[PDB]
Amino acid sequence: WSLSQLFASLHEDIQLRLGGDASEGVWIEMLDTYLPKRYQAANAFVVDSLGNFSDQIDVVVFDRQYSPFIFKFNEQIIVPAESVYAVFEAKQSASADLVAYAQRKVASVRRLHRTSLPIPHAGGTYPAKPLIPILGGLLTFESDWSPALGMSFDKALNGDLSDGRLDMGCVASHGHFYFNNIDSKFNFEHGNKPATAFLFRLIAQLQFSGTVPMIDIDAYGKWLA
Template sequence: MSWSLPALLQGLHKGIHSRLHTAREVAGHPVLKGDAVETVWLGMLSDYLPERYRARRAVVVDSNGAFSHQIDIVIFDRQYSPFVFHQDGLDVVPAESVYAVFEAKQIITAEEITYAQDKAASVRALYRTSLPIPHATGIADPKVPHPILAGLVTLESSWKPPLGDSLTKNLGARQGEHALDLGCVAAHGIYARNGDGGYQVEETAMAATGFLFELIARLQTLATVPMIDVRAYARSLKA
């Protein structure tokens, strides 16, 4: 047997694409379809992200008691985060531990982009604590909380061409806390926000694999999460 890296990468994409297509064809009810799509993307991220990360359907909470919307995919730290709550099949994750949030849908449309942007803003609006960090030679300054990545992953596009001006125009219509940084249309390619707020698209036959690699590269630039102030959360014990 001879090994081939391109074949391995293509196989990863084909597996995701096939499962997304099956979810669309088999799951009859819209809610079931949505759950099936989330499961496919969560499965890929759980299998291939480094162990320091977790990917779950979750709600995000801050130390002031404010909550985000329910998010299809939250990528968060599990190495340094001291707690994650589990409630009725849903995780509740402290805001400080969040690296990225994604919505997972069947088809990318203008409405779904707006929906994902609102979800992202609900997380980014939360307050994040950050304490000084003790180390072997002293105490480091608190880390400035990193930007939280956000995006939308789908199987198909509602536009022709799938990754054309209609896509980038809708993505770029809202910036700041609503901006989507990275996404995948598994049947066609990936899109990514650059430093000036514009979007680059890449048509590729291995979109899911390309998305995974770009996501990991961007997660690497975020380094570790800030040191959470657990006592700030503990104040809710007196409420």
């Protein structure tokens, strides 16, 4: 027995679960199965207290226990922006158009307005908590490029380094990528367990994402009238 064999057997199981238009369903199932249970994953819209909506997001990772509400409307799910940790776009194959599309979706979430309130206590008032740093990314099974994880993909990822920045992602047939804040560049990792390596990159980053802030629930509630 070895820790390497455990990882190989986990990847075999993930590949079974996993194996364009509707490819997000299997990524949802995988992430809702293997993320720490404090997180929840779903296909969802994101909304803010100003009544603005994101695009429809293939995979939203949000707080399971501490989200204040989750709307269920016309067979869709809508989550408040303040309880979102990550957002992914899925499609069968990576291309320049899909990367740009993923960037636009992710931007549509990050441009929402998130609230965060100060916290009273007996002695006085603690400052408002920081907002969650929302991770963005893309999930595909294949790539239109040859090589799959090379200069052309890197150029596409570099097309949005602000609101639409993709922090990480997976091409299931070849590997995964993540943005390296130190060197300010994308890193590619090629390997024979891509989805599992992606999962471990995501879990490693999420544990530093903090927690849901004190939300201006009253501001959401004004829309009751």
